């Protein structure tokens, strides 16, 4: 299947098998994709705004120039998959396993990453301004050039996380050191 | 006044030696516990493996001097002038050194467990190997000092002033990888 320029608000897609679905500029707003099989699906320029994804399988899928603004993901199969310029602004990703995903240059402004496993992820140039990172795991992740708040440095687990020089400094300041 | 003098295993206990001025005097394994060295002066002298328990040292001046391996216990050390002094392997745990100027001093493998160094000036000092568990370095000036990764993980450092290289080092001491 292939859906182009569709706009749905409040739709119930629960338990559906949407594997290999292709969407192009689809707008899904406040839709429920819980229990859905979205494996090997392809989306381009579509939006999943304030949607519900509980126990949804997104394995091997591809999202290019998509927005997931404000959507909530609970215990979903989110890896591996291809994200190519996707906006997660205000999404709730808490508790999921996102290990090793390439989130290069993605927007994760005010995203909730509480208890989220982002180990070995590539977050180069990503934007984490305002994200909630209590319990988040960033060990071995690459944060080079990412925009991050002083609080991430105090919250996220960061052993082996790769950082640039301004970031190492912000980390020291975030722990109370006075750069004199 | 002890000039170019050398003592060993001597007990100076409870003696009043205030305003003493030593020069090139060297003490080895001597005991100054309870001694009064108030407003004393010393230049080029060494105090090797000596015992300083409850010694009074306030207002003395120590210039170009060594305290190698000496043990300090609950000493009156403030105020004090310590100009290029070597505390290598000395034991300072539990002492109060708040605000002292320790610029350029050596504290290599010095034991500072629970030692109060707040607002101390430690610019250029060498702290390599110091034992810093419980050491308080809050608001102390550490710029240009040589410090090991473990100090970054054990001393309290709120407000401590550091340069870029030390900040980077603090981050690596916690597991961040600079790439």
The answer to whether A145 and A168 have CB atoms below 8 angstroms apart is: no
Identify the experimental approach. X-ray
Kindly report the backbone phi and psi dihedral angles of residue B165, in degrees, each rounded to the nearest multiple of 5, phi listed first: -60, -35
Resolution (A): 2.2
Chain A residue with the nearest C-alpha to that of B139: A178
Q: What residues of B are in contact with residue A169 (Cβ under 8 Å)?
A: 164, 167-168, 171
DSSP state letter for A38: -
User: All domains of chain B, ordered by start, with CATH?
Assistant: 1-179 (2.160.20.80)
| B27-55 burial: b if 16+ Cβ within 10 Å, else e | bbebbbbebbbbebbbbebbbbbbbbeeb
DSSP A55: S
Specify whether the CB–CB gap between A99 and A117 falls below 8 A.
yes
What residues in chain B have their Cβ under 8 A from chain A's Cβ atoms? 139, 141, 143, 157-164, 166-168, 170-172, 174-179
Residues whose CB falls within 8 Å of the CB of residue A166, separated by 6 or more in sequence, listed in order: none
Largest CA distance in chain B: 59
């Amino acid at each position: 299947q292939q859906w182009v320029d569709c706009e749905f608000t409040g739709r119930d897609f629960r338990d559906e098998d949407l594997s290999r679905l292709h969407t192009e500029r689809a707008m899904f707003s406040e839709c429920d994709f819980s229990g859905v099989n979205l494996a090997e699906s392809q989306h381009r320029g579509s939006a999943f705004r304030n949607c519900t994804f509980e126990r949804t399988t997104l394995w091997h899928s591809t999202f290019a120039q998509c927005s997931m603004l404000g959507s909530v993901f609970v215990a979903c199969r989110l890896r591996p998959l291809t994200l190519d310029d996707v906006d997660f602004t205000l999404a709730v990703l808490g508790g999921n396993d996102l290990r090793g995903l390439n989130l290069t240059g993605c927007r994760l402004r005010e995203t909730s990453l509480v208890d989220t496993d982002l180990r070995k992820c590539v977050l180069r140039g990503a934007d984490l301004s305002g994200a909630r990172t209590t319990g988040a795991r960033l060990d071995d992740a690459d944060l080079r050039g990412a925009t991050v708040d002083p609080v991430l440095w105090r919250t996220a687990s960061l052993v082996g996380a790769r950082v640039d020089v301004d970031q190492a400094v912000a980390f020291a300041a975030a722990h109370g050191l006075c750069l004199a």
